[PDB]
From a paper:
Peptide hormones, such as parathyroid hormone (PTH), neuropeptide Y (NPY), glucagon (GCG) and secretin (SCT), which adopt α-helical structures on binding their receptors, play key roles in human biology and are well-established biomarkers in clinical care and biomedical research. We set out to develop general methods for designing proteins that bind peptides in helical conformations. We show that by extending RFdiffusion8 to enable binder design to flexible targets, and to refining input structure models by successive noising and denoising (partial diffusion), picomolar-affinity binders can be generated to helical peptide targets by either refining designs generated with other methods, or completely de novo starting from random noise distributions without any subsequent experimental optimization. The deep learning methods largely converged on the overall solution to the helical peptide-binding design problem—groove-shaped scaffolds with helices lining the binding site—that the human designers chose in the initial Rosetta parametric approaches.
Inspired by this success at optimizing binders with RFdiffusion, we next tested its ability to design binders completely de novo through unconditional binder design. For Bim, 25/96 of the designs bound by yeast surface display, and FP on the highest-affinity design indicated a Kd of < 500 pM (bottom). Circular dichroism temperature melts indicate that both binders are stable at 95 °C. We solved the X-ray crystal structure of the Bim binder, and found that it closely matched the design model (3.0 Å resolution, 0.57 Å RMSD). A kinked helix on the binder adjacent to the interface is well recapitulated in the structure, and a cross-interface hydrogen-bond network designed between Thr73 and Asn77 of the binder and Asn20 of Bim forms in the otherwise hydrophobic interface. To our knowledge, the Bim- and PTH-binding proteins diffused starting from random noise are the highest-affinity binders to any target (protein, peptide or small molecule) achieved directly by computational design with no experimental optimization.
Numbering used by the authors:
A (entry chain A): 2 to 115, 120 to 135
B (entry chain B): 142 to 163
The structure:
Amino acid sequence: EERKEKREKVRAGLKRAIAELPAEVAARCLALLDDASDEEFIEAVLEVLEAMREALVAMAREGRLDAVRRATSHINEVLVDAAELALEKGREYFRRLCLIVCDMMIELIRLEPELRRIRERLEEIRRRLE
Amino acid sequence: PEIWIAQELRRIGDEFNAYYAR
């Protein structure tokens, strides 16, 4: 039963994250989230996550370092429940999240001027999963 | 098992948002 609970919590944090995006991408991520039934959900989450990773890196090179922060924080508050659900449907669904989320933050860290410690752990967690 | 990596990712991810730009 708790699958539905964790799905609404992932639906909530991702919505709050998407609200920090431009309206062009905030439309597709929002339609993919709400037109995916209940078993493509994790696929839509990984789709919305891949579009978000695509979005936040462009704004990070622009100077929108505050929107990327506010957006990723909402990605963070649902990162554990998304991995648990993705692990419930398949070990590959777990691994897809890091390759999105881990790769997202890594490029976000590799863009901001002036911690390599976090970049370091993110790379190995990617390697250890690969 | 794998759930630890998830908790490690929020931990690492929450630290990224803390000490990002400023």
